[PDB]
Amino acid sequence: MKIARVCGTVTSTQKEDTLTGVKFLVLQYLGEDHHHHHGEFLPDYEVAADTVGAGQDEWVLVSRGSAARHIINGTDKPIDAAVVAIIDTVSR
Amino acid sequence: MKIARVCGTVTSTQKEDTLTGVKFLVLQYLGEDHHHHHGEFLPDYEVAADTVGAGQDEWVLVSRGSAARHIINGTDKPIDAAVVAIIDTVSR
Amino acid sequence: MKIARVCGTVTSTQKEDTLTGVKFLVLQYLGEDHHHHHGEFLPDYEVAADTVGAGQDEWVLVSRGSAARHIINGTDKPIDAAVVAIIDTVSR
Amino acid sequence: MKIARVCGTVTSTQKEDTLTGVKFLVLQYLGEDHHHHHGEFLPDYEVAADTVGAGQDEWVLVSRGSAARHIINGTDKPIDAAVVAIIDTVSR
Amino acid sequence: MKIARVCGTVTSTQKEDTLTGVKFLVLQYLGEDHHHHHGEFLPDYEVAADTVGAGQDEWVLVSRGSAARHIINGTDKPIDAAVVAIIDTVSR
């Protein structure tokens, strides 16, 4: 889906060369439970790397298009999910 | 499926650089309910960007081929659904 | 699947620029019912464009490889199903 | 899956231009039944084209990577399953 | 999923030309059973090739992006799963 939840994630400098230059973040399809409780997840199957964007914790646009990473990385090579754009709307 | 329902969508100028130049629209596989009632949806997992086409509200052809965005965008880079063509037939 | 049923389809000149040059046809995974009755379908989710081939109505080979459209279209750009080859065998 | 069963298949010279040069073979995910009986299948949805390899009838490695067909075909264009490599191990 | 279990695998020199240069390894989505017992699997549908990385036996990052194999292979051609990066964290 276009809308997805992005969680913070940082670790010792370690990532693919092509992935280098992009911050590693954790993405989760599931979000708030019944519009209530933030909820917590342990599994990190879905991984996304992109710059810091406001409202990323709640909801943000995501895509697998290489174009998203092309602007930051370019030369084309890396394949993964990235934050092409962000939404001003935020949960309250 | 080739046939899909396209809904209007506009917001503050905010989109990927490669996506720039293409109008952001919302796509929904589900349409009229039992050939009755237009119906309404809240989820926007499926996102499509393309020019304005007649009959888009009812039914329109859609594809993920980069060729569709190549004509408008070109240089190849952006990946997503777009309206390659439209059908003259409309619901009545 | 490699084998698929192709149905005829023609309408007012309207198709993507990259799709231009290829005849628009309707493809359906489902075919004869229990080796009996031709059957009829209304939905056209699966869309395929290619030249006219014998035995297409019954069964014909299909693929999404851009190579198929490359020979007819070339320059690479359009993405969809096309009739790479046809089978001499036909239902009787 | 990497491991798949390859069956023999030959017909009148008829195949896509890009597919030309590669022998047409039939691939089937299902193999021996409960390590017993070879079994037989009629459906040929999964189609694979590659050179003749020993142990292909029993089990052989398969991939959709264009690199496999690149070595034989090259120039990149055709997309399908091919025998990148074969295993010396055979059923007995 | 980003996290996957990698198992050792070595055999007589036999692999696709494009795959040449990369060690052949076996990947399995399933790992420890209920955080207990290492467990054992016979099926090898998921195949991954990459260099030797610490913690690969337990958990390691994996991706299908050609960029991963591009650094090792380059020229682009081979398509498969590879270890883009490894995690220092290990089961204990």
Backbone CA torsion sign across D50, C63, D8, D56: positive
**Paired strand residues for B27:** B6
Q: CA–CA separation, A60 vs C91, rounded Å?
A: 52
Inside any domain, residue B91: no
Inside any domain, residue E62: yes
Inside any domain, residue D71: yes
Indicate the residue of A44, A45, A77 with minimum beta-carbon distance to E70.
Answer: A77
Q: CA–CA separation, B26 vs B49, rounded Å?
A: 8
Q: How far apart are the first and last CA of chain B?
A: 22
**Domain of residue C77, residue span:** 3-86
Inside any domain, residue E91: no
Token pair for residue B86? 């439209």
Query: Strand, coil or helix: what is D68?
Result: helix
Q: CA–CA separation, C29 vs A71, rounded Å?
A: 39
Inside any domain, residue D91: no
**Paired strand residues for E33:** E36
CB A58 within 8 A of CB A91: yes
Q: Which residue of B has its CA nearest to A66?
A: B77
Question: What would the DSSP string read from start to end of B2-60?
Answer: -EEEEE----SS---TTTTTS-EEEEES--SBTTB---------SEEE----TTTTT-E
Chain B residues within 8 A of C25 when measuring between CB atoms? none
Strands (E), A1-92: 3-7, 24-28, 47-49, 60-61
Q: How many CA atoms lie within 13 A of C84 on its CB side?
A: 26
CB B29 within 8 A of CB B1: yes
Q: CA–CA separation, A67 vs A73, rounded Å?
A: 9
C-alpha closest to that of B84 among B26, B72, C7: B72
- Do C and A touch, 3+ Cβ pairs within 8 Å? The answer is no
| Backbone angles phi and psi of A68, in degrees to 5 | -60, -45
Q: Which residues contact A61 (CB under 8 A, 6 or more apart)?
A: A2, A3, A4, A83, A84, A85, A86, A87, B47
Q: Which residues contact C17 (CB under 8 A, 6 or more apart)?
A: B71
Q: List C-alpha distances in Å: E56 to A25, A39, E63, E88.
A: 21, 30, 14, 10
Inside any domain, residue D58: yes
Number of structural domains (chain E) is 1
How many helices (H) does chain D have, and how many strands (E)?
1, 4
Question: What would the DSSP string read from start to end of C48-72?
Answer: EE----TTTTT-EE-B--HHHHHHH
Q: CA–CA separation, B56 vs B5, rounded Å?
A: 7
Inside any domain, residue A15: yes
Q: CA–CA separation, A22 vs A6, rounded Å?
A: 14
Chain E residues within 8 A of D66 when measuring between CB atoms? 77, 79
Indicate the residue of D12, D18, D44 with minimum beta-carbon distance to C2.
Answer: D44
CB D83 within 8 A of CB D69: no
Q: CA–CA separation, A77 vs D76, rounded Å?
A: 17
Residue B66, H or E segment? helix B66-72
Q: CA–CA separation, B48 vs B28, rounded Å?
A: 9
Q: What is the CATH number of the domain that holds E80?
A: 2.40.50.220
Inside any domain, residue A92: no
C-alpha closest to that of A54 among D41, D69, B14, D74: B14
Q: CA–CA separation, E46 vs E60, rounded Å?
A: 15
